[PDB]
Design a protein around this ligand. Sequence first.
Ligand code: NAG
Ligand code: FE
Ligand code: FE
Lengths: 31, 679, 48
Amino acid sequence: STNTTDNIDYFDISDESNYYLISQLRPHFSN
Amino acid sequence: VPDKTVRWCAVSEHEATKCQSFRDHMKSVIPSDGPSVACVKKASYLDCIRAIAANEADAVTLDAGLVYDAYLAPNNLKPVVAEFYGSKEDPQTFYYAVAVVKKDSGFQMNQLRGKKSCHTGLGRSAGWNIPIGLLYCDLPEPRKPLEKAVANFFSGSCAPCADGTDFPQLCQLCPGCGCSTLNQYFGYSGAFKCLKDGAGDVAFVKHSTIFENLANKADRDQYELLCLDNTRKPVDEYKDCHLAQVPSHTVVARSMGGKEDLIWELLNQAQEHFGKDKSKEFQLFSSPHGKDLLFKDSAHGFLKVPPRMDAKMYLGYEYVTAIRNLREGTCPEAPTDECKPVKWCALSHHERLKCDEWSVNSVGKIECVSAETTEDCIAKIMNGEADAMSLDGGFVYIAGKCGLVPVLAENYNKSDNCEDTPEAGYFAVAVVKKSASDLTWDNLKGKKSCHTAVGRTAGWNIPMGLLYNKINHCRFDEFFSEGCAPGSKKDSSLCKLCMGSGLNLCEPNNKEGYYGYTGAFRCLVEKGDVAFVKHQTVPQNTGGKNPDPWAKNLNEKDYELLCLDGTRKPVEEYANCHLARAPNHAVVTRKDKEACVHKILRQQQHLFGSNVTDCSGNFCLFRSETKDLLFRDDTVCLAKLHDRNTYEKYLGEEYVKAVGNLRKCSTSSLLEACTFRRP
Amino acid sequence: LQKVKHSIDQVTALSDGVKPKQVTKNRLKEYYFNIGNYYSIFKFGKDS
Ligand SMILES: *[C@@H]1O[C@H](CO)[C@@H](O)[C@H](O)[C@H]1NC(C)=O
Ligand SMILES: [Fe+3]
Ligand SMILES: [Fe+3]
């Protein structure tokens, strides 16, 4: 049975102006 | 639907071109997530005010005198961004209003009758209110309506936006009064053109108008501007020949829907890229097909209007009173023989009880108006809806910054002549117990600290001003582990140690039990480690002096106060161990009702002072039900202030410096709004 | 998912559509930059 998480990369942070969002998928930006 | 646009008002199509250029050039340097501009074309300024009220548009730029016509209901519009007029180095917020006249025309200020006059608008600040308000009371009856008597005063004139149908003499020199740039004599440059074309004998503008329209020094050496002292002076010096100072033009917006953060977010990224030759392609503060479009051509920058400041605090009190008297038409004579009843101010429904009982036990000379914080009642004094207050010296500094003055100052020492004697002040201490002997002023990390309230002298300013120079950073919610200080922010640990339930936690008034000196002593006895109070707190709650049982059981000797070097000195000997000497509290009021509040409180003191015995079954103004309400309970008499009536002179140098070392750490919004005024 | 649905709603909302035979150069730049960014939102949305 599975008691652990393998993939964690759903964390993301945005800028203080909230203009751009970074992601942990490639290419790491929308632009 | 782009969902984040700031609508904007243009007054003609001739300004809507400028709005379209500002929109397309401002589209680039903001990303697509940020806000954008949209343009709405309305005919006049007042129709735009009604447009923003009925949620069509969102922003426009108006003068100081038209914000008074913008906040009256059902409009409710607030200034959110104000603009600056000096250089980038020393930003000025006020600007001067002057009256420009042709050379050798032979008028001083007092012969100014029946001569064709060039105004800039109906209700604009520098062009209507100061000229008509200056020459106002020489007019004959009936004064109201104002335009009828000014219309019979000048032999024809041009003031735009006035109703030409009911009044033809105002719209005579102009063909028809139009409230846009389509009228060729509207605005600052338009009123100066009303002087230059020869049709007008006097034109009322600001000081930079003669600079901006002419490029020749000799042609500016021709034209002159007339003073208050009936003299003519050249236009190069407007510091000495100015009529009055007015606040800046502002971008108004709604009061409830806003949205203000998109206006500031838009213009803040606008004045950087587009301010003063910052882009050569587009100009924000200049235009090829007109002048003063959407902004002034004398503006250099935009700063935020603080969120505490509403309309009436923006215009001030002198200017609101001058425009309101100029609308209603009163022109007061005012010899001071009898004084009106003083509208006192009181907070939070215990001071309303004691205040109203004092209102009935007087003849009718003291009335009551309430508030819910002390910070709001200071603003209510500044508006005019109340007159006096009794404040401790930390809020005497705030109300001193804001423009109030102290009048009478409370004594504490019993004497046969205390109306004359100036007391030095009272000593601030911190009180700890016999149960904990490990405590020490050098050892205060992670200990619970009870406080009177935020902004007060002995509870916040004096101790945390001394703790600040050791800990060197502004946050005090991380130094102490816990502690009870009311009035601070609801998130802090300083908020969540206190007891006032429910939803009244950290509310700086008698809703909490822990507010005041004695409530700081309550959290000291119950749940705290150290409290910051006056030196007289422990004798007033020691030994059955309080019938309330928790102080009925207590004793003096167990509680001992601590010095700042780290030793123990007894509460009985307070003089050799104190944090600092803070001044006594003071009664503040506006500068015009100083003599009245002085007179009424001096007479009202002798009836209800400390001479009166048998307090239960009579009235004793200085005693109270141990909660220290409307007055400090151990006052003896309201001392006279002679030669010393200014927060600088009364508070003394050491306390003004001692607060000035904490002024960068202060978070009270009303102090920020009061110190917005200063250039 | 909200940004994906808003992107699809705006693009198909532009597919009614307003039909000029000619536009300005900066208007054309505003167009291609505009719905190009909507492709960036959508294709950035699917894998997330
Ligand atoms: C106290 O009250 C009495 C009686 O009303 C009065 O005669 C006396 O002057 C008062 N005390 C002072 C210091 O004025
Ligand atoms: Fe103005
Ligand atoms: Fe005090």
